[PDB]
Write a protein that binds this ligand. Structure first.
Ligand SMILES: Cc1cc2nc3c(=O)[nH]c(=O)nc-3n(C[C@H](O)[C@H](O)[C@H](O)COP(=O)(O)O)c2cc1C
Ligand SMILES: Cc1cc2nc3c(=O)[nH]c(=O)nc-3n(C[C@H](O)[C@H](O)[C@H](O)COP(=O)(O)O)c2cc1C
Ligand SMILES: [Cl-]
Ligand SMILES: [Cl-]
Ligand SMILES: [Cl-]
Ligand SMILES: [Cl-]
Ligand SMILES: [Mg+2]
Ligand SMILES: [Mg+2]
Ligand SMILES: [Mg+2]
Ligand SMILES: [Mg+2]
Ligand SMILES: [Mg+2]
Ligand SMILES: [Mg+2]
Ligand code: NA
Ligand code: NA
Lengths: 399, 399
């Protein structure tokens, strides 16, 4: 069915429908697919879904010149811990990714691989089964009681990374980025948001370290910036973006309750701009808005009203992708895209609307999403959401 | 004469004319007199002007319930270096300040003493004459070539403060704050702006230290925060505010060219909010806007368009006074005061309009200022600017 009560607005007369270049890619509009974990990868080996993933991405590439950021992809076994999320370390994985990238390109769209390392969000028992550590910044603060207890039961207590182990992750980021490019991706996004490992280092709640990787703003940002620099060196700044969620609380990050949180993220933005002014500007910065501090809460819930991401624009002078509850709020998008370097990520409603871009241009009704199938091993709720035309034929204009 | 071409707007229908409490003071409107050095203090001894200063402040206190921040006042001889700016360390000074504070209070207005330490902005030859150091954060970067050369000629080369000397300044801030309160002031403003000593510590251009007072965001903010904490302890948070100029370039500060500048100031704001949440909220934060990066340039010049102070409001949750080119821009003020904790400082046009508040409420013409008498040892251009009524009688509605 269509979302009831939603009053659509045609956005074709806004900058959302003006072309923009991101990295090497000439986008034809500024509606971006943000990274969306869907849990259709198959075990063993974290293999992108051999039956459905090509079709999923093909559908969502249908509007020419769309920027697609993939579901998060693990850079190595140790970086993972969800059996049904994909990786980008093995030949068997890359065979499937190559097909996905080719399909997106055939639709004249673009694809950026999000590179993910889970840290404390991983399942410690899966990791133990596979002979892997349960990692985070620290060893004395935990995501929640259940995770702490699972780790202990698995004889895999949370482990504070050594400097050598941080270096090993950086090597894996580099190789994962190389693999992604070699398989045909247009670029990569470094996931430093939503309470995963890099965010666990950024945040003073999760990072109680007293070495050079914690205990100050500069130290907490060190790992994220080392990954940025390693990937810029390996594949070029024009092929690298960075995702941040300053006000997020998902996965036990601090959000605005931490009075130093804006300074922490302002520091990262400033270091990005310093690199840019020295000739190595990242393709984009991708921000999760305080509009959505936890993406598993219904739109409108978990809104933090005490902060704005606007500060980033005073610092970083390149493209900025904003995501969080924009599909149901074209009136907000209309204002935000007046800034000529702003793009808008649409997550949950891209799950349910393969032709979302047409719907945004033309002010059409939106298909309701089905949260129960966000994570499910099924084509249902993955590749069977209709286009607007197909929905009309099903009679959704009445139902 | 009146400013030609200026199209006034009545602001009586805005929050500029709603009461607000700042510290212990019930203000009746939100037009604030920011600190304005006028150079009428007499030598020797940096004595507030015995002939004219009471009248100057009385005139500008005339609208009941006005918050006045004094001209900067030196906390000690070593903090000074301008012979015609006043101090607040001696009995002879406080005799004159007492008269000024009494006069402001008789007009049912309020007075906050700005506490000033010049650092590298001081004149090294005056300091040498008086047996005093020429101080800054560092000893290997200078305000400009002329200052460096003056210091060398005076056998008084710029000196990087020791930790003990920083402690001595803090003692002097404490005593100056006590003196101000005992003499009748409503509070004090810590000057950490416009490239004076505390700002020289905040800014990475001027602060090349490698001890705990430089080399990182936290270290560069340490001196400013130590002064905040010492004054909060001595006289109470409700009697203390702090002035900052994030984007200023006056006195060779970095401004927006420094990519880390927003993070530096965001850190200070966050530390202020942390203290506030722990029960010790400063009376206000006073920001110089990027609208005026150098207050000796004509309105509209030296405007930095690449940054906003809005970030501070995501962090600090108390009153904020904004200053910089607002008199000629009632349309901007109208928008800014929609925020219910925003006050507006009017500097140069309070020099020339003793009845500025009435003029703002009622949308009246503004007297042109005379920059040549901003700093001058004279009543002329100090206490002889007319009220609107007096200007009409002089025929300025025609001239
Ligand atoms: C099912 C689901 C999976 C998600 N997976 C990821 C992910 O892999 N990486 C990431 O950075 N964000 C992920 N997110 C967050 C989204 O990218 C997005 O920031 C968030 O859903 C807010 O945007 P929206 O309101 O348009 O959905 C996910 C969100 C959902 C609902
Ligand atoms: C003559 C003059 C003296 C000033 N003296 C001080 C001072 O003692 N302390 C301070 O913090 N700012 C001082 N300022 C800066 C003003 O407080 C104010 O921030 C600036 O003039 C911008 O506001 P305006 O455009 O309303 O004048 C001075 C400015 C001028 C023009
Ligand atoms: Cl799993
Ligand atoms: Cl995520
Ligand atoms: Cl002088
Ligand atoms: Cl000043
Ligand atoms: Mg242990
Ligand atoms: Mg169902
Ligand atoms: Mg499910
Ligand atoms: Mg020396
Ligand atoms: Mg003259
Ligand atoms: Mg003069
Ligand atoms: Na099938
Ligand atoms: Na006289």
């Amino acid at each position: 069915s269509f979302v009831k009560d939603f009053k659509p607005q045609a956005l074709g007369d806004t900058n959302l429908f003006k072309p923009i270049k991101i990295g090497n890619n000439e986008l034809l509009h500024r509606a971006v697919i943000p990274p969306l974990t869907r849990m259709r990868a198959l075990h063993p080996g974290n293999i992108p879904n051999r039956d459905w993933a090509v079709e999923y991405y093909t559908q969502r590439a249908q509007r020419p010149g769309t920027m697609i950021i993939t579901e998060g992809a693990f850079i190595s076994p140790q970086a993972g811990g969800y059996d049904n999320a994909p990786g980008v370390w093995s030949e068997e994985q890359m065979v499937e990714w190559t097909k996905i990238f080719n399909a997106i390109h055939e639709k004249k769209s673009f694809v950026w691989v999000q590179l993910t390392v889970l840290g404390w969000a991983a399942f410690p028992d899966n990791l133990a089964r596979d002979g892997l550590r349960y990692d985070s910044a620290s060893d004395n603060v935990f995501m929640d009681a259940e995770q702490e207890a699972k780790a202990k039961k698995a004889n895999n207590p949370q482990h504070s990374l050594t400097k050598d182990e941080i270096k090993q992750y950086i090597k894996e980021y580099v190789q994962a980025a190389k693999n992604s490019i070699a398989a045909g991706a247009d670029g990569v996004e470094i996931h430093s948001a939503n309470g995963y490992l890099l965010n666990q280092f950024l945040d003073p709640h999760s990072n109680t370290r007293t070495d050079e990787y914690g205990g100050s703003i500069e130290n907490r940002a060190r790992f994220t910036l080392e990954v940025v620099d390693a990937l810029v060196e390996a594949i070029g700044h024009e092929k690298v973006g960075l995702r941040l969620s300053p006000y997020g609380v998902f996965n036990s990050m601090s959000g605005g309750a931490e009075t130093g949180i804006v300074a922490q993220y302002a520091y990262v933005a400033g270091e990005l701009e310093k690199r840019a002014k020295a000739g190595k500007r990242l393709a984009f910065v991708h921000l999760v808005e305080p509009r959505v501090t936890n993406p598993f809460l219904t739109e409108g819930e978990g809104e933090y009203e005490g902060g704005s991401n606007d500060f980033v624009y005073s610092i970083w002078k390149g493209p900025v992708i904003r995501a969080g509850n924009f599909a149901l709020h074209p009136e907000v998008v209309r204002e935000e895209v007046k800034d000529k370097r702003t793009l808008i990520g649409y997550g949950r409603f891209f799950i349910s609307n393969p032709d979302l871009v047409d719907r945004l241009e033309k002010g059409l009704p939106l298909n309701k999403y089905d949260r129960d199938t966000f994570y499910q091993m099924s084509a249902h709720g993955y590749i069977d959401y209709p286009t607007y035309e197909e929905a009309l034929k099903l009679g959704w204009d009445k139902k």
